[PDB]
């Protein structure tokens, strides 16, 4: 159908690759395509350069490294629960100094995981994503002292785990103090160690306001750098012998050692920019010609005194500024952990260098790769910043890869974060999305990267701007750091332009974030687009300008939760970003070059290009995602079809013809309905289920292991003791459920028998045995069964057996069987729906079509929304979307309305008129006039002041229709709704929160080991936690027996619960409860602390709750 796009804003540049930060970071770190000699010193190369050479005698040096090919492809790694990775080889050479012997060998360091094309990883068969970490950028900062108003604190910050933060402060007694590892000592001493003399400090700092004299100490200058050095070592190392070389080593390692101390390249640059100096290295000082030489400290102290005195050109720093904060991407974190593991490897190397045969040592004998591996794995498996990938829809993955976390190792602990850290900084413009952050505990600490935003090589986020010269807007684009942005007056993207020239006398612009009205002569730069201010998700919200930010947050967050539907459609009203999202997420399949399509199948698509080559693209079909959403590609092309470069070959999940489909376009009427839509609840039509709208496929994986035991082996078999053929009906010869079979709760997916524990039969069992004359079988039924509330059709079975080619399991396991069960979920009561504007609700009622409010022509609405949700939530974007949707319903078209530049009320009125001519004038030719009900409603509307009195019925109906309202007939009555109701097409998604995955109930079940309380969780078939607050509720109600019953009978009291259940099944009232087991646990644990806890009567005579079992 026709797609009408609005807006006058022309974007000069498109959006960059949205995954580019992940891909380019990891690629930069690896340098796998760069020949060994051409590799810059960065990433793992840098780690090798720091770790080597290793001395102490023998010397093990480093030449180059290489990454081999992955032993297994991505898919196969996903299936076999293997990590997708490449082997890392490193060429080393051992050199004995005296002998001169050189033994060179290539050593195998293990594997490193490789990033996939979409920017994610595969670890142990599970897709994972490394979230970027925002932190304080290294450098030199100056901040106002909270205690002392006229004094300032200098702070020298290196990279995380690169060595200590150093604090320079002017003490109340006048002396300048330095703080390292929580130790306060006069800076004078260190300055003497650096080789400074009283003369040099006097001439350098002299112009200052007597601040110099605080640095003046006669006892310090009376001694040479050596004595001062030993003095400093005695100050920083109490009890440690003040040996000369040990002091030199400690101080060098503290400051000058590049191996143990590293400023960032960004820290280096910023330090050079702030202090106005030049660094020969990333360290605060150097060891040169036997002594220490000062790189940094003196300019820092100089700047401190200069700021304190009030000397012009010296500023305090904003640590929340995005010029002072930087982003650590995948490559940097990976490089860090790699460097740690490599250091451990080095310790191992020197260790093995001390012990051994000194004559014969190969690099292989010295190198134990294990720690290195152990590091990398540890960073991928257990790290805070390594997250389980969200595969829910393509936008989920894309957004997940664009995450920015202030948390993590070396980052903010929670409740270390005040309002400042979580605040939206003025420099967040065009860089970090102000809209998208989680609600609750993570707010502001977890953010999303802006669409046009880019992270530079230093780790700072940069946003694009257009160069403006003399009122002319060039197509030249410049990406700026916040520090660079602060230097310019930057116009807004909506400022009127005739050609390339500014058409307004007064143009709205920003100076250091501050709003200001300026002349075209004053404008240096101009915004690229309103899109650059927000995250990709936020940019998917039409009429965003009409929605309150707090609701836009929810609308943004919930698109991530959108479940892919079989019938899923692109929104009627789009922001025009729907295609790029599908493209960059690698959801859909596209044509590599121009050519003709050869073969078309559900499984695969063969294409012949201009090269004459035949390329076959296999289609991913019904593959289970991380969240269990079905990911399947479907062919959008037919045999013989001519396709150009970039054309769409096949549609990915949640994609309609290349456009992002998060849900359905439904006809909604906004009215209160019988209290069924009360408080955000939603009422939907059965016709939605009839045509399979909001129907989604979900695949669950079940897994069972047969292992060797000391009591005899477990085995998967179709022979299960004490079971009828009826139960074994769908089981195959080997005991596994067949493909295509329907499974319900209680059914057996995989039959398994296990040898019983050693059994001493109770006399009852023996007597009953003699009565029925049947030998008690050797094994028992352990078979994996369908968990309560689950089920479906079995679409796959995997069987891995030990002793079979290409298959080796973990020790003791005989074999492993997996069963994949798919189910088709129709929308039901309790499922969660939401729109892009932040209006969310659970479906309360599904009415039959005849109960649904309908149009005069007989067309029933899909969804009934309550208007009460609108005013307090202040999101009007859904209203406008509804109106334009009403227009596009009868006009049979869809629209593109970009954010902040888009469809305006008058234009929508035009489109609604065009729509009305189709909706009404059709009726007039059909031989029907205005209905009586329409007349009544028109009277009501006349009194309402919606329509002008005196006009014909058609004119008034047109007036209502233009306001987006129509006459609506109640299904049950046939009488019209008294007022005209707003009706129109709205794009609504079914979120991942579904009543089926949630609803749970328990009579009795498994209990915890020590506490003997019921387990938590649904999969554990656990009970609901009754906590302190619930207990408070029961106490306030004054219900003693209910509460006591919860604490004892229901749980944690063994005799109590057994007796209670037995009594209930017997038809007897429950008995008197007894002492809860966890109290006994408390008593014994208190005894383990050597505290005697005695339960006494009123006679103060001991009462034994253990009943003599604990007393000798």
């Amino acid at each position: 159908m026709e797609i009408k796009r609005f807006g006058r804003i022309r974007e000069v540049i498109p959006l960059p690759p949205l995954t580019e930060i992940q891909v380019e970071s990891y690629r930069r770190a690896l340098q796998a395509d760069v020949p060994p000699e051409k590799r810059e010193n960065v990433g793992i190369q840098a780690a090798f350069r720091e770790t080597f050479p290793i001395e102490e005698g023998l010397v093990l040096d480093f030449l180059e490294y290489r990454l081999g090919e992955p032993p297994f492809p991505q898919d196969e790694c996903r299936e076999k629960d293997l990590t997708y990775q490449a082997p890392l080889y490193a060429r080393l050479q051992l050199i004995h100094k005296d002998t001169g012997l050189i033994k060179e060998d290539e050593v195998f360091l293990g594997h490193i995981p490789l990033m996939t094309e979409d920017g994610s990883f595969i670890i142990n068969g599970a897709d994972r994503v490394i979230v970027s970490q925002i932190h304080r950028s290294p450098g030199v900062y100056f901040t106002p002292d909270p205690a002392r108003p006229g004094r300032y604190i200098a702070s020298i910050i290196p990279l995380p785990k690169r060595g200590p933060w150093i604090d320079l402060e002017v003490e109340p007694n006048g002396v300048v103090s330095m703080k390292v590892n929580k130790r306060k000592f006069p800076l004078v001493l260190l300055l003497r160690v650096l080789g400074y003399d009283q003369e040099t400090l006097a001439r350098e700092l002299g112009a200052y306001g007597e601040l110099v004299q605080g640095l003046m100490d006669e006892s310090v200058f009376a001694m040479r750098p050596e004595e001062a050095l030993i003095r400093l070592f005695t100050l920083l190392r109490p009890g440690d012998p003040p040996k000369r070389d040990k002091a030199v080593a400690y101080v060098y390692g503290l400051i000058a050692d590049p191996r143990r101390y590293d400023l960032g390249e960004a820290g280096r640059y910023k330090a050079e920019e702030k202090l106005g100096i030049r660094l020969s290295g990333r360290t605060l000082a150097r060891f040169e010609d036997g002594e220490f030489k000062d790189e940094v400290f003196l300019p820092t102290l100089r700047y401190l005194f200069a700021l304190t005195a009030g000397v012009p050109g010296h500023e305090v720093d904003d640590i929340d500024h995005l010029g002072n904060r930087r982003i650590r991407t995948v490559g940097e974190l990976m490089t860090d952990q790699f460097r740690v593991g490599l250091a451990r490897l080095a310790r191992g190397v020197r260790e093995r260098m001390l012990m051994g045969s000194e004559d014969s040592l190969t690099p292989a004998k010295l190198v134990n790769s294990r720690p290195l591996e152990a590091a990398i794995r540890e960073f991928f498996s257990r790290s805070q910043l390594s997250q389980f990938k969200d595969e829910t829809n393509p936008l989920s993955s894309l957004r997940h890869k664009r995450r920015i976390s202030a948390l993590g190792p070396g980052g903010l602990t929670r409740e270390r974060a005040g309002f400042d850290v979580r605040d939206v900084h003025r420099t967040h413009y065009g860089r970090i999305c102000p809209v998208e952050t989680p609600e609750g505990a993570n707010i502001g600490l977890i953010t999303s990267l802006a669409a046009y935003a880019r992270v530079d090589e230093l780790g700072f986020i940069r946003t694009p701007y257009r160069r403006v010269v003399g009122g002319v807007v060039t197509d030249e684009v410049v990406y700026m750091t916040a520090t660079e942005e602060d230097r310019y007056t930057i116009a807004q993207a909506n400022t009127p332009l005739e050609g390339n020239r500014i058409a307004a006398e007064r143009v709205v612009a920003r100076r250091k974030g501050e709003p200001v009205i300026v002349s075209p002569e004053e404008v240096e730069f101009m915004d690229v687009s309103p899109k650059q201010v927000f995250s990709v998700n936020t940019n998917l919200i039409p009429f965003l300008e009409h929605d309150d930010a707090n609701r836009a947050l929810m609308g943004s967050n919930m698109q991530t939760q959108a479940v892919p539907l079989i019938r899923a459609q692109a929104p009627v009203v789009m922001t025009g970003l729907e295609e790029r999202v599908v493209r960059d997420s690698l959801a859909a399949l596209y044509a590599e070059e121009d050519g003709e399509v050869a073969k078309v199948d559900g499984n695969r698509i063969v294409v012949r290009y201009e090269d004459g080559r035949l390329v076959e693209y296999p289609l991913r079909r019904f593959y289970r995602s991380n969240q269990g959403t079905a990911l399947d590609q479907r062919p959008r092309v037919v045999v013989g079809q001519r396709v150009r470069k970039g054309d769409l070959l096949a549609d990915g999940p949640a994609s309609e013809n290349g456009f992002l489909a998060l849900g359905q376009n439904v006809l909604v009427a906004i009215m209160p309905f019988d209290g069924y839509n009360f408080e955000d609840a939603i009422v939907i039509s059965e016709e939605l289920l009839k045509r399979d709208f909001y129907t989604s496929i979900h695949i669950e994986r079940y897994e069972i292991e047969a292992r060797d035991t000391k009591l005899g082996p477990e085995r998967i078999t179709r022979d299960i003791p004490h079971l009828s053929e009826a139960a074994l009906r769908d089981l195959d010869e080997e005991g596994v459920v067949r493909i295509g079979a329907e499974v319900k709760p209680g059914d057996i997916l995989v039959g398994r028998t296990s040898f019983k524990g050693e059994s001493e039969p109770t006399p009852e069992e023996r007597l009953l045995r003699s009565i029925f004359g049947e030998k008690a079988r050797d094994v028992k039924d352990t078979s994996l069964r369908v968990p309560p509330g689950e089920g479906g059709i079995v679409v796959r079975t995997v069987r891995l057996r030990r002793g079979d080619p290409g298959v080796e399991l973990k020790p003791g396991v005989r074999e492993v069987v997996r069963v994949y069960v798919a189910q088709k979920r129709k929308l039901q009561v309790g499922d969660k729906l939401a729109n892009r504007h932040g209006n969310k609700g659970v479906v309360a009622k599904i009415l039959p079509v005849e109960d649904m409010p309908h149009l005069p022509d007989g067309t029933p609405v899909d969804v009934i929304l309550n208007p009460l949700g609108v005013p307090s939530r202040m999101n009007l974007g859904q209203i406008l979307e509804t109106h334009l949707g009403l227009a596009g319903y009868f006009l049979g078209q869809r629209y593109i309305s970009p954010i902040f530049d888009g469809a305006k009320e008058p234009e929508i009125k035009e489109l609604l008129a065009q729509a009305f001519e189709v909706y009404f004038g059709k009726r007039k030719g059909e031989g029907f006039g205005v209905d009586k009900r329409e007349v009544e409603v028109l009277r009501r509307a006349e009194k309402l002041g919606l329509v002008t009195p005196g006009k014909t019925p058609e004119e008034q109906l047109k007036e209502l229709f233009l306001q987006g309202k129509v006459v609506l007939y109640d299904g049950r009555t046939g009488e019209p709704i008294e007022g005209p109701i707003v009706v129109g097409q709205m794009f609504i998604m079914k979120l991942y929160h579904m009543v089926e995955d949630k609803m749970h109930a328990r009579s009795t079940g498994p209990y915890s080991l020590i506490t003997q309380q019921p387990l938590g969780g649904k999969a554990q078939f656990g009970g609901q936690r009754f906590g302190e607050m619930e207990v408070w509720a029961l106490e306030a109600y004054g219900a003693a027996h209910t509460l006591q019953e919860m604490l004892t009978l229901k749980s944690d009291d063994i005799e109590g619960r057994n007796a209670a259940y037995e009594a209930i099944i017997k038809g007897e009232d429950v008995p008197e409860p007894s002492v809860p087991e966890s109290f006994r646990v408390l008593v014994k644990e208190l005894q383990a602390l050597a505290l005697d806890v005695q339960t006494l009567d009123e006679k103060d005579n001991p009462v034994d709750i253990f009943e003599g079992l604990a007393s000798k």
Partner: protein
């Protein structure tokens, strides 16, 4: 797919001739309000009854005037005449004119109306007006048979020049209220339960009223017969 349906059973609960309750369950899903609404519309508008369509009183010019010797105004007397329940014993009789003449210290009731052939007053104890010493009340009231509710302006009938047009309430049914509750037959989940409540004036019993309402509807279904 394969469906079996037996029942409903029609249950009746009655208090005198003034009231009744009717319960029809189980019904197929949606049939609760499908039966309910039409009957309510028919019961209110289409049920035959009697009303006072005009009133003449001596010496009074119009409706907002007052009557010397009588404590109630012309307005109040008209209101009481609206609540008068008249029943026509003969199905042939379309309309009656009832005369009332009384004076002195007396309280006029519906009994005081001079009896007419085949005309029964259901509520003879209904109060019309109180007269004082010297008070004189002479009135002729027009009673017609019809349906629904007709304002005094719409019928516009006058026997004489001083005859006052009265809002005419024909419908013997005072109120109809129904409620549809979800009920279950065996494992059938969504089945509807219809409960009907009818208020009458006693001239026509609720059960009679309902049976007339379903007959009217059934008769309308036969109108689809011959194009």
């Amino acid at each position: 797919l394969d469906s079996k349906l037996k029942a409903p059973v029609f249950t009746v609960r009655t208090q005198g001739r003034e009231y009744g309750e009717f319960v029809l369950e189980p019904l197929e899903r949606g049939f609760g309000v499908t039966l309910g609404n039409p009957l309510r519309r028919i019961l209110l508008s289409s049920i035959p009854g009697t009303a006072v369509t005009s009133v003449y009183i001596e010496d009074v010019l119009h409706e907002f005037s007052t009557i010397p010797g009588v404590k109630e105004d012309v307005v109040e007397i008209i209101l009481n005449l609206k609540e008068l329940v008249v029943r026509f014993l003969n199905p042939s009789l379309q309309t009656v004119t009832l005369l009332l003449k009384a004076e002195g210290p007396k309280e006029v009731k519906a009994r005081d109306f001079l009896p007419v052939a085949d005309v029964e007053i259901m509520n003879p104890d209904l109060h019309i007006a109180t007269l004082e010493e010297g008070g004189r009340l002479n009135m002729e009231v027009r009673v017609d048979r019809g349906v629904g509710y007709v304002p005094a302006e719409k019928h516009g009938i006058k026997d004489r020049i001083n005859a006052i047009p009265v809002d005419a309430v024909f419908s013997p049914v005072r109120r109809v209220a129904f409620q549809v509750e979800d009920t279950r037959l065996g494992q059938r989940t969504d089945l509807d339960k219809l409960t009907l409540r009818i208020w009458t004036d006693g001239s026509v019993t609720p059960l009679e009223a309902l049976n007339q309402a379903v007959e009217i509807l059934r008769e309308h279904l036969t109108y689809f017969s011959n194009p």
